[PDB]
Amino acid sequence: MSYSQTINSLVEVVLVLVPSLVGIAYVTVGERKTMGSMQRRLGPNAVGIYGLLQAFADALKLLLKEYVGPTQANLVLFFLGPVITLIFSLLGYAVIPYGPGLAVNDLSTGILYMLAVSSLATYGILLAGWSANSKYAFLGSLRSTAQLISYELVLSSSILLVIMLSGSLSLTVIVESQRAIWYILPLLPVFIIFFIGSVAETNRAPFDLAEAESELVSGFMTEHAAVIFVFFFLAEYGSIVLMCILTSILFLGGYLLINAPTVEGSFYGLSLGVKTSILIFVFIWTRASFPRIRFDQLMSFCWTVLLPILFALIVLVPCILYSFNIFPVNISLL
Amino acid sequence: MASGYGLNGGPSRCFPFWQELLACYVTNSSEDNPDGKNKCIPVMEDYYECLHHRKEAARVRALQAAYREAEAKKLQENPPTAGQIRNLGLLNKEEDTKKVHCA
């Protein structure tokens, strides 16, 4: 190579983490300003020009706010759960292609990597809620466990239908395969279902049961203050963007367009971000449109509506592939 | 190993040794002669050697101790540096290659 391995690895990680953590801060302001417009409001417009420094004041305010360790709380776990949720939520950005193979890890199995990292971070929510040893946080954590028993099979079922078309499990190859057609056209029911599960996966509304404010006070994060609360917020909003990126990876062609490398690489980055930003809007639009579902009804919806339909596609879709001679070669090509 | 299916989608590295042992048994052992299978003994040790490597581990231990004790005792003139080794067989580094090969 031309320069050091460690430096190339260094600047690539920075170019991924730093712009993403900046992107996370603006989704929080953007949601507050988007719902307000739907609510005939303005949203943040006085912490920085047009309100563009609001997330930083919120972040800085909490890192200077006193932490409390409850006497009834198992304290090592009280701190371990938010730290697990944050680290393991942010790890999911290590396999996103911002171009063909332009990922921190172009892994051959990056889809399974994302399922492992998301599942491990939800276990922090469960642990932190239980550790608090307060009723509402206890009821919050039990809902989060019910919720993962609801959406995890749904996403894993949905993605397996994308892998049947792509044949790869590598995020770049799936995007490259969509140069034929975006997977939202042939897999239109799967796109709706995967999007529904992603909203449930992120504990976003209408599925905000674990942290519901009108039923529990803050659910799992009710005893959590200062930096611990901020760890859970960055995990949640970083999960929203990551799931919007993954939905764009799997159904909307990823980075596909709708000095010379820099000009080209920019178009891939914009194209992925534009499609991600549209799906980020759909989340915020969804929180603003609907009531909260009841947690019994979310479990029944995933288990008697979504999964029965997804199992039937899992049968139907390969039968269409063998019939039309369109099973993808599973070798390395794209 | 014995199956025929390895890690890359290609065949297992010890499969030829397994097929020879099965071939030997079927083609030497019989009901008429119980002792044809004694021909299969060397074939059986080789299948275990391709599996565990104890005999090839034992040879390299002997030669490696013999080799290091010889090079250690041997007269030393000039060590070829890593950069010189990295320049072996390049396009415009003839001097470095000649030093490495001592030619």
């Binding site: 063909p100 490259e176 140069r179 034929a180 794209l334 | 890690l7 890359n8 590295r13 030829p16 080794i85 072996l88 490495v100 090969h101 001592c102």
Partner: protein, 169 residues
């Protein structure tokens, strides 16, 4: 050494010892990955018999192919040097134009179709060699002679046309 792919390799081992005088010397091919992919279908069109003879010799001596088929291996190396020299003395600009595009394109052949269609017509009229891929579906036009490549990032230009031997403009 073993065919297992290494996971903890921090070192490399060399061997300055040369093959014994009893084995005839063959100058090894000096071409790199991108040039060899651009010349592969011309190596195949000239050295198929030699390539096919090496592999049939190895399948004729199981476990001993490395030591008992050395003459065939020297024959393939020599045969494949002939095409490389021939392409060099007759297609040097087009050949470089193709494998350089291939180097910038992930060695994907569909990503450099206009450079292949020029290099192939130069090879066909000079070295009289022609790219053939077996069992391509007959109904569909061959993929290396399709005007539109669906997986190409830059669309094939309308002016650039595919090269079919035996057909004039």
């Amino acid at each position: 050494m073993a065919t297992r792919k290494p996971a903890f390799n921090q070192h490399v081992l060399l061997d300055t010892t040369p093959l014994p005088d009893s084995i005839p010397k063959v100058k090894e091919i000096g071409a790199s990955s991108a040039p060899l992919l651009s010349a592969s279908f011309f190596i195949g069109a000239r050295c198929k018999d030699y390539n096919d003879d090496y592999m049939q010799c190895k399948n004729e001596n199981p476990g001993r192919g490395e030591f008992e088929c050395l003459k065939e291996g020297r024959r393939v190396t020599r045969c494949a040097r002939s095409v490389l020299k021939d392409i060099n003395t007759h297609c040097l600009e087009q050949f470089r134009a193709h494998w350089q595009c291939l180097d910038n394109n992930n060695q994907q052949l569909w990503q450099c179709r206009p450079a292949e269609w020029k290099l192939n017509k130069c090879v066909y009229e000079n070295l009289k060699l022609e790219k053939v891929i077996p069992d391509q579906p007959k109904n569909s036009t061959p993929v290396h002679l399709r005007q539109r490549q669906i997986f190409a990032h830059h669309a094939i230009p309308p002016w650039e046309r595919p090269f079919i031997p035996g057909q004039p403009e």
